[PDB]
Design a protein around this ligand. Structure first.
Ligand code: NA
Ligand code: NA
Length: 235
């Protein structure tokens, strides 16, 4: 039994991302394009700030800017909420608390438009410090690697997640961005309430040497883990 949701992700799927943001009254828009290959947990994306200069560091937007591309091991596929709701999609909401600084609140809708997987986001940030690490651009442009811990959320027919991103500061210190996440279905198909598990996620950030707009190139890999269902007994 291969679900409709799963069969949607068996090959290379084009991705579009559109974000509108306002952090401390600094308004900005970001567009992204690329592709996802869930068979490999692999994402290739390029984002551009279409309004001019981004008023916050690119690294702080990575997690906001499509966990339906995670590779779920075969023995865990029954726990993949993200693909289970496709093509109608899910709402993804977060609060991201920057320690000793402000917070982002984000709301996104992730769904197919024809054969393209789209992430449409609104981001609002408040309470940031004028010359803190975020509005002062004091974060290095680094590899990001952490686990996303997922739990079921029965009363919204969805999931919650939590994780901590540790952004290095330009003085060698660390800016914590503590993430709280909820996802709930847009449609009303079968409800997948996963057992606890995590997504091991690695994002590599680079620049396109021929691109003069403010932008970010991402190569990302995302793999579900943390559940065995007796697989160990096989060996
Ligand atoms: Na981690
Ligand atoms: Na990577």
């Amino acid at each position: 039994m291969v679900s409709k949701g799963e069969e949607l992700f068996g090959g290379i799927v084009p991705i579009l991302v559109e974000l509108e943001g306002d952090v401390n009254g600094h308004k900005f828009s970001v567009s992204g394009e690329g592709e996802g290959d869930a068979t490999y947990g692999k994402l290739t994306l390029k984002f551009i700030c279409t309004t001019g200069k981004l008023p916050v560091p690119w690294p702080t937007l990575v997690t906001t800017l499509v966990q339906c591309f995670s590779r779920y091991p075969d023995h865990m596929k029954q726990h993949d909420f993200f693909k289970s709701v496709m093509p109608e999609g899910y709402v993804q909401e977060r609060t991201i608390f920057f320690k000793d600084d402000g917070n982002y609140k984000t709301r996104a809708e992730v769904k197919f438009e024809g054969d393209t997987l789209v992430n449409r986001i609104e981001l609002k940030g408040i309470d940031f410090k004028e010359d803190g690490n975020i509005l002062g651009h004091k974060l290095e442009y680094n590899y990001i690697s952490h686990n996303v811990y997922i739990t079921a959320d029965k009363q919204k027919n969805g999931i919650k997640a939590n994780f901590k991103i540790r952004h290095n500061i330009t003085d060698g210190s660390v800016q914590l961005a503590d993430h709280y996440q909820q996802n709930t279905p847009i449609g009303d198909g079968p409800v997948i309430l996963p057992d606890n598990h995590y997504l091991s996620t690695q994002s590599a950030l680079s620049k396109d040497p021929n691109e003069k707009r403010d932008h970010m190139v991402l190569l990302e890999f995302v793999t579900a883990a943390g559940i065995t269902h007796g697989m160990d007994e096989l060996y």
